[PDB]
């Protein structure tokens, strides 16, 4: 059927850029058919929000720096200066058909300048560890870009397999990701082992941060 | 003062039914098309229907078509999906929204939506576990504390700090499905190292879909 | 580009038949895109009203007697029971494009049972022929059908040429026409000649009617 | 009393100017989408342009685009087409019609209708001259009589009986153009023949363009 094809899938861009969005008809549509082409933004765990209507109408309320245009086939979404809060996810809709459809989205992070984590570990708390379980984690706070490396260690033992790691949608304010690495072992494991240690690689640090600590200290 | 609300989402058996609601406000829905529109876990948009309530006039994407019907009560403001015979694929968040003032083809109003959750596991609700740095430990004047809110099932848990007065700093990670089959995540704060020890820091943990809710004081551990 | 092609672009049909009217578009059209096809109605000297709209929903206050559907690129408008108010021209409109564009019509007429012209003859007023002209008319009243004959003589000379007819629109109620013949003379001409009739032929009439005045006589 | 009310129609010359309004009661032409469609002589409809009030947007037929602007004055409820550079092809009666209430797609109101004539003709009121009624010419069980609305330009004329107090048996013709360049038409009753020269019948012509109003008395001429 009709679709909408949207590119770029994902960019980066630094405040102040001029960012656009493309949106293009799947076929050739008959002549004077209307899609009544809308762009949406959409936040984090939020509803989408209405930027444009009919292709190049500002939505009230919407900043000017959000414009529409369109011609032909295709359509644009431009944001002129690019703002820390414009970090969304933008989706064109076509109403060409009924239903409509919108088009993949287009994921737009801010690019800022390198911030090395902030590192801290915790220990197990001895009430999980009644049930059988520690989970050790890790926490990387406020740090661009998003890629980080965390290496786990019980007595030097490198950990592989056993850790699960999680990061926040890119902070709205100050661009900067955390992310939390949390590591699962029985407590029969856990309490045969002294050392614990977190290691972390970032582009933000000359070289690996370690935090440790040692159980029952 | 327009707004939509949803409510009614949860966890369902596949196969199953559910119906979900959209109350409005500011406006009445008579003069509008509302419209359905879902989000599958880090998925995009999808169009799932509308109707024009006056006279009863709805249309369906193929992906649902006979299986969901909405529908609407002029009277109560209040819009509804029907949706049986549900499916993995169908878990998603569900929006309402609508067309507003003759400007049509724009949804211009948008509920916070609702989570469905199409499954076959038991909901169940999270032990939560206080993240304190180990009493060794040093800083540099910021110090991390934090609840690891475990083993729970469906999503959503919600999280704040000192019942809504502590925001600047926190960070609460999108939850992680562990093997077993239940989500788990932590919530984690950072403050002035010096307070540790006199000032209290609470987490407030909601899981709504098993009625769990927990205030967990998290402290440096007594040695 | 994209049009509607009505048809048929003229009917005749009796009291209860039941009438089904249809538009077509002229070319292949993506599927899923819709038409939203509306159909009006519109009598003489009147606006067009709604009748049927988004291919199939009444609009209120409309007879139930008016459905319409479609599949694919056809509608259909149906009056499943015709009545005397519904003659009138019907048209379909498609919203495919922007600007929409309509059907180019199609013209539903009443049948009904024969019925012969009243036949009337006027004289020209004598204020007329003050300003050098003379017109006489002659006047066919609440016939059916339609087609009908009027043929002027003057002293025996027919008049060719001469003349203009009109006809009413078909009575919303009666379904009946009527009809104006109106001979033009100079005053001078009228003034040379005595016998003016007007002849009629129609269905209804077994024979020719013929009205006449003699100028100059009561 | 939802209504829409068109004026400003008449004769131009051609690649004259005119304004038509389009008065609108019983609701806000900010709701709506306003529409003008016009009608040639024996023709079909030809929709010309909408307009959102609210948006200022606006489309045209290619057959008017450069040449008529439509707006409006939502202070005073009232739509407008300016039209220039008129041709004798734009010779129509104009409607403006709208969209109610979100309901797209739908002309639900529409107003009577205003014409518009473009010629290089003046306008010129017609002359009225009875068609009486005689006893002595009975067809069809009655009497008839009329009124003769002769060479008149442009269309167009009314006729009512009595004020309006007559109108069981009253056809008023189409007019026809005559070989002059001028309009005639009659408009006739049939009556009892017992009423004759006992009733007044007057018929009241009305041509606008000219402003012309004549009542002529129509009664048997004298035996």
């Known amino acids: 059927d009709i679709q909408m094809t949207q590119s770029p899938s994902s960019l980066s861009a630094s405040v102040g850029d001029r960012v656009t969005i493309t949106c293009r008809a799947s076929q050739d549509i008959p002549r004077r058919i209307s899609g009544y082409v809308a762009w949406y933004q959409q936040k984090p765990g939020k509803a989408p929000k209405l930027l444009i209507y009919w292709g190049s109408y500002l939505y009230s309320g919407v900043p000017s720096r959000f414009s529409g245009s369109g011609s032909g086939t295709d359509f644009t979404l431009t944001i002129s200066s690019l703002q820390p809060e414009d970090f969304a996810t933008y989706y064109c809709?076509?109403?060409?058909?009924?239903?409509?459809?919108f088009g993949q989205g287009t994921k737009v992070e801010i690019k800022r300048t390198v911030a090395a984590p902030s590192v801290f570990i915790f220990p197990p708390s001895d009430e999980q560890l009644k049930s059988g379980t520690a989970s050790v984690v890790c926490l990387l706070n406020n740090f661009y870009p998003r890629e980080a490396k965390v290496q786990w260690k019980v007595d030097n033992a490198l950990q592989s397999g056993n850790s699960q790691e999680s990061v926040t949608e890119q902070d709205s304010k100050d661009s900067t990701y955390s992310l939390s690495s949390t590591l699962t072992l029985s407590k029969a494991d856990y309490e045969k082992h002294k050392v614990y240690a977190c290691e972390v690689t970032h582009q933000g640090l000359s070289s690996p941060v370690t935090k440790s600590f040692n159980r029952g200290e | 003062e327009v707004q939509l609300v949803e409510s009614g989402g949860g966890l369902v058996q596949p196969g199953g039914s559910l119906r979900l609601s959209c109350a409005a406000s500011?406006?009445?829905?008579?003069?509008?098309?509302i419209h359905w529109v879902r989000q599958a876990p880090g998925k995009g948009l999808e169009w799932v229907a509308r109707?024009?309530?006056?006279?009863?006039?709805?249309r369906y994407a193929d992906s649902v078509k006979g299986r969901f019907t909405i529908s609407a009560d002029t009277s109560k403001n209040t819009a509804y999906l029907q949706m049986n015979s549900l499916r993995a694929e169908d878990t998603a968040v569900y929006y309402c929204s609508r067309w507003g003032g003759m400007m049509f083809y724009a949804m211009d109003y948008w509920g916070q939506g609702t989570l469905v959750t199409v499954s076959s596991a038991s909901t169940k609700g999270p032990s939560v576990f206080p993240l304190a740095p180990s009493s060794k430990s040093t800083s540099g004047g910021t110090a991390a504390l934090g609840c690891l809110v475990k083993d729970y099932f469906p999503e959503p848990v919600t999280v704040s700090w000192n019942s809504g007065a502590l925001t600047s700093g926190v960070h609460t990670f999108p939850a992680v499905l562990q093997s077993s089959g239940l989500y788990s995540l932590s919530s984690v704060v950072t403050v002035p190292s010096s307070s540790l020890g006199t000032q209290t820091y609470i987490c407030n943990v909601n899981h709504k879909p098993s009625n769990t809710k927990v205030d967990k004081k998290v402290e440096p551990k007594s040695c | 580009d994209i049009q509607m092609t009505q048809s048929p672009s003229s009917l005749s049909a009796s009291v209860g038949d039941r009438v089904t009217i249809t538009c077509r578009a002229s070319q292949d059209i993506p599927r899923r895109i819709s038409g939203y096809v509306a159909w009006y109605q519109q009598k003489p000297g009147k606006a067009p009203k709604l009748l049927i709209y988004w291919g199939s929903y009444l609009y209120s206050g409309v007879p139930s007697r008016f459905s319409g559907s479609g599949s694919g690129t056809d509608f259909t408008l149906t009056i499943s029971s015709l009545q005397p108010e519904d003659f009138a021209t019907?048209?379909?409109?498609?919203?495919?494009?922007?600007?929409?564009?309509?059907?180019?019509g199609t013209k539903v007429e009443i049948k009904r049972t024969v019925a012969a012209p009243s036949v009337f003859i006027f004289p020209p007023s004598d204020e007329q022929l003050k300003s050098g002209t003379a017109s006489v008319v002659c006047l066919l009243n609440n016939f059916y059908p339609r087609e009908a004959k009027v043929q002027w003589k003057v002293d025996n000379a027919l008049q060719s040429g001469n003349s203009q007819e009109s006809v009413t629109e078909q009575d919303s109620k009666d379904s009946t026409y009527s009809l104006s013949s109106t001979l033009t003379l100079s005053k001078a001409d009228y003034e040379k000649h005595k016998v003016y009739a007007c002849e009629v032929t129609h269905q209804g009439l077994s024979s020719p009617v013929t009205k006449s005045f003699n100028r100059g006589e009561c | 009393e939802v209504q829409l009310v068109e004026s400003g129609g008449g004769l131009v010359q051609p690649g004259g100017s005119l304004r038509l309004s389009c008065?609108?009661?019983?609701?806000?032409?900010?709701?709506?989408?306003?529409?003008?469609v016009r009608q040639a002589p024996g023709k079909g409809l030809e929709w010309?342009?909408?307009?959102?009030?609210?948006?200022?947007?606006?489309?045209?037929?290619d057959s008017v685009k450069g040449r008529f602007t439509i707006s409006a004055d939502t202070s005073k409820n009232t739509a407008y087409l300016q039209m220039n550079s008129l041709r004798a092809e734009d010779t129509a009666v104009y409607y403006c019609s709208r969209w109610g209430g979100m309901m797209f797609y739908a002309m639900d109101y529409w107003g009577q209708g205003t014409l518009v004539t473009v010629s290089s003709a003046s306008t010129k009121g017609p002359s009225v001259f009875p068609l009486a009624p005689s006893s002595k010419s009975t067809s069809g069980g009655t009497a008839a009589l009329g009124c003769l609305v002769k060479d008149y330009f442009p269309e167009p004329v009314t006729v009512s009986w009595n004020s309006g107090a007559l109108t069981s048996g009253v056809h008023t013709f189409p007019a026809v153009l005559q070989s002059s360049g001028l309009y005639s038409l009659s408009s006739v009753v049939t009556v009892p023949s017992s009423s004759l020269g006992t009733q007044t019948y007057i018929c009241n012509v009305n041509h606008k363009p000219s402003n012309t109003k004549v009542d002529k008395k129509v009664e048997p001429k004298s035996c």
């Open positions: 500011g406006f009445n829905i008579k003069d509008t098309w």
């Open positions: 109707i024009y309530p006056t006279n009863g006039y709805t």
């Open positions: 809709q076509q109403h060409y058909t009924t239903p409509p459809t």
